[model samples]
Target: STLKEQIGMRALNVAETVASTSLVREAFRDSNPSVRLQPFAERIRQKTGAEYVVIGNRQGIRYAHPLTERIGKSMIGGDNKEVLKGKSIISEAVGSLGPAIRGKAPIFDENGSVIGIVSVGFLLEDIQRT
Candidate 1:
């Protein structure tokens, strides 16, 4: 449906844009990368109305998560293979927050290496009400 398309695209676009940003690159280098990403992810979440805007390293360790405890932990979904190879994709996966439609994008460094990942997700339950 057009409705789901628009909503899903919003997550995809946001993930792609965030993946290309310098801030996301810096977060990967910071001593406490998760702490560095906290504010940035929160701002995106608030503005985009996303259930979560997660930033994780190439190893899939989360640098940003909606729940503070989740930061520094490995990413829940096993949906990052292609994203780590510098591709972007949309998929449904169950996370700590439950099932969601998420757009995952690979964050590339200046040397064209996949340094991190951006995941912008919308809860399925949240969308059902729309």
Candidate 2:
């Protein structure tokens, strides 16, 4: 019974990691291709300290953002392809055309399909320089 209890720990850890990683991947690649939330995102960024709070696709393809330049841009560019293979990629702080601290996660559909991802990046410096 002790051995089985220890096994549970490993399974629990794996599950937690998977869930968190899945969120990062899907968040980067958002499935909802809507612009109605633009105003809300803008207001939040303006009020809160979030320089850029965006929602993108699983492939890091941005569908909607407060910044117009990132409308159809791809941030991942196949670099974090590992996440595409059902892994959560915890990347280092790197600078890109869009945001800074980019966090990506995957989105699941009703049929349990990994449809897309959602991403959010810190855009304070990028916004000012732009």
Candidate 3:
């Protein structure tokens, strides 16, 4: 439960930060927003102490990911379904980044269409250590 508690606060914080930023707005306005947001995402991950941060289009192709090679790949975690449907969630899943507690939020365009998902995760092991 502590893991959930910790990840919950961070998840909400990061989600709010992402939702309110120009990055989210520009993602809808620009060409290849994922490419433009990659480095920006990395800084957020580093500063926030998340194990990984990912942004994916509605089809599940990751535009920005902690692992560069995984960019453009289909996301392995099964968390995208509801998130792509425009639901914000916090949950646990095992995927390419291993077992983690993730907080995921939908990315919307200026017109309010669900365009992508943004997520930040803390590895389970790391959570256990705290």
Candidate 4:
């Protein structure tokens, strides 16, 4: 339904916007990736009321999560295979918080390498209501 598209695309824009931000790109090279990225991710998530804004590196280790304890751990969802291949997509997957429809963006470095990923999710249940 058109309702799904409109709400779902908010995730897409957020993932893409955060991916394009220079801070996100630079954070990928930081020693503690979460130090710089998490707070910014937190701020964005709050402003948008997104389920979560998760950022991860090529290693598949999360740099940011809604739950601070989740940082430095591997990302779940088993839906990230396509992102490393240079894709931005809307996909369904389960997180620590449960299932969601997520928008994924592959973060690129100056060398045009896929260095990280940005994911913005809308809780699947919320999708039904919104």
Candidate 5:
């Protein structure tokens, strides 16, 4: 469906923008990155109508998670690989929470190092509603 495609792309754009924000960069630079970004990500999650908002380091360790407990653990999807290499993409993949349409974007530090990725996913059911 075209609406599904549009929503997916919108999710991608939002994820990329959030990833590139100063708030995300500052979190990455902090001593306890997960603690710093968790609440921020949660706020975005609540406002964005996404199933989840995630922030992860280049090593695939999640810095922020909607579940909180998932913070500091490895994120379930492998889509971060390309994003961490500075490529942005959107795709559908099945992770620990089940299948979802996801948008992934790279997080860069002030000097342009790709420090991590920000991901936003919409559950299939949620998209189906639209």
Candidate 6:
């Protein structure tokens, strides 16, 4: 599990580094860039052989498409609270919410402010079992 923590920390560091780099600033003026990271999400899902994959902005919209049904929906009740506060959240099993394996990574802007969030969700069941 140490490797997971290391890799996760490394990933977050990399995200922060990329966001702070000037290229990101120039490419995305004012941190107002709105991106749909579905492509990256899909690639990860395919590569990892996960049950499903979803990436979203802080709003928790399932940005990875078709699964777009989750788009504009909120895991945190319509806010980006935790993500905005600069934290990487992982849920091994999203019980009550559903049989999903989900995680969230904060996407930062040049100033290192979390401006968005990348989320992933995978599952075997069609709906959450009560």
Residue 123, model 3, lDDT: 80
TM-score of each: 0.93, 0.50, 0.88, 0.94, 0.93, 0.53
Is 3 or 4 the stronger prediction by lDDT?
4
Residue 115 miss distance in model 2 (angstroms): 1.8
Better model by TM-score: candidate 2 vs candidate 3: 3
lDDT ranking from best candidate downward: 4, 1, 5, 3, 6, 2
Give per-residue CA lDDT, model 4, range 1-130, as digits (tens).
5866777787889999999999999887788979999999999999989999999988789999999888989999888888988899888889788888899999999888898889899888886764
- Number of residue pairs clashing in candidate 3, backbone atoms closer than 3 angstroms, sequence gap of 3 or more or interchain: 0
Best by lDDT: 4
Candidate 5 versus the native: TM-score? 0.93
lDDT score, candidate 4, position 121: 91
- Residue by residue across 1-130, what tens digits does model 1's lDDT show? 6666677788999999888878888767778887768899999999999999999887888888989999888998789999988889988899788888899999988899988889999888887774
Q: Give each model's whole-structure lDDT.
A: 0.87, 0.47, 0.79, 0.89, 0.84, 0.48
The lowest-lDDT stretch of 10 consecutive residues in candidate 4 is: 1-10
Candidate 3 local lDDT, 1-130, one digit each (tens): 5756777668756965775577766865667777677888888888988887787778888887888998889987798888878788887888698988888888887778888888888888876674
lDDT pick, better of 2 and 4? 4
Which residue runs does candidate 3 get wrong by more than 4 Å? none
Estimate the overall C-alpha local distance difference test score of candidate 1. 0.87
**After best superposition, candidate 3 residue 90: deviation in angstroms?**
0.4
Give every collision pair in model 1.
Answer: none
Q: How much is 21 displaced in model 1, in angstroms?
A: 1.5
